[PDB]
From a paper:
The long interspersed nuclear element-1 (LINE-1 or L1) retrotransposon is the only active autonomously replicating retrotransposon in the human genome. To insert a new copy into the genome, L1 uses target-primed reverse transcription (TPRT). The EN initiates this pathway by creating a single-stranded nick in genomic DNA at the semi-specific 5′-TTTT*A-3′ consensus sequence, with the asterisk marking the location of the cleaved phosphodiester bond. Therefore, the EN plays a key role in beginning the process of creating and integrating a new L1 copy into the genome.
To aid our docking efforts, we solved two EN structures by x-ray crystallography. Third, we used additional approaches incorporating structural information to better inform our docking strategies. We used ZINCPharmer to generate the pharmacophore and filter the ZINC database for compounds that matched the pharmacophore, followed by docking with LeDock and AutoDock Vina. The inhibitors identified in this manner were AD28, AD29, AD34, and AD36 (Group 3). In this approach, we screened analogs of this fragment using structural similarity and substructure searches.
Author numbering: 6 to 239
Write the structure that this text describes.
């Protein structure tokens, strides 16, 4: 009745060397479900991503070696998919399914560097029909959601404020920030002027809060992004 969901922008998987490296890290972390961003695999190279122990994999890829997302499910986890929706451009993938008769919807997103919060709000609208009370939206938003997400505590811009409102209209909350309202933890440590920011996020339905046992930010040597882990009581 416990599953862990892990998100990491992996910064490219095209080379077999990097794929082998990612696989070892996953084996260690032993997540039930893993959301990866920036695989950079074109839609004709998706078959390249194989990780022993995580046979169920769902990918979304554009026509070029940029963006690219994947959701990997552990062989030990009974996830039964019912709907998969893939971005033509490789910036998100949504998987709906059930674990032990419990519905879960996972939207893995990689937002672009330019116009990130507007882009996420658009995807929310495009998929408004697919969001529900058991929805997790995780990945590299390429934007803070509040001042505490930046070591500078710079006010978030109007667009971000709009994204935050669209999220609340759908009864979606920043799950990390809700469990850790005062924390100053970061996932990207090369922000502009020697600054740090939390641009990776785990957002989710308010009704999932009762199931959230723990979150953990996992700094690593694989990527220029730290991973985020969520422990969920199914
Ligand atoms: N690499 C882009 C990333 C830099 C931090 C920035 C911020 O803190 O607003 C937004 C996203």
């Amino acid at each position: 009745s416990h599953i862990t969901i892990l998100t990491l922008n992996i910064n490219g998987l095209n080379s077999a060397i990097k794929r082998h490296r990612l696989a070892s890290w996953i084996k260690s972390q032993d997540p039930s479900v893993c959301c990866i961003q920036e695989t950079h695999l074109t839609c004709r190279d998706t078959h390249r991503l194989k990780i022993k122990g995580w046979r169920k994999i769902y990918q979304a890829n554009g026509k070029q070696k940029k963006a690219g997302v994947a959701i990997l499910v552990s062989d030990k986890t009974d996830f039964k998919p019912t709907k998969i929706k893939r971005d033509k451009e490789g910036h998100y993938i949504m998987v709906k399914g059930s674990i032990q008769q419990e519905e879960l919807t996972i939207l893995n997103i990689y937002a672009p560097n330019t116009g990130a919060p507007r882009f996420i709000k658009q995807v929310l609208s495009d998929l408004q029909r697919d969001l529900d009370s058991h929805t997790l939206i995780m990945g590299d938003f390429n934007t803070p959601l509040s001042t505490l997400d930046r070591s500078t505590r710079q006010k978030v811009n109007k667009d971000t404020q709009e994204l935050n409102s669209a999220l609340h209209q759908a009864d979606l909350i920043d799950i990390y920030r809700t469990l850790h309202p005062k924390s100053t933890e970061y996932t990207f440590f090369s922000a502009p002027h020697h600054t740090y920011s939390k641009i990776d996020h785990i957002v989710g339905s308010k009704a999932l809060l009762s199931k959230c046992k723990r979150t953990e930010i996992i700094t690593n040597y694989l990527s220029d992004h730290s991973a985020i882990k969520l422990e969920l009581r199914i």
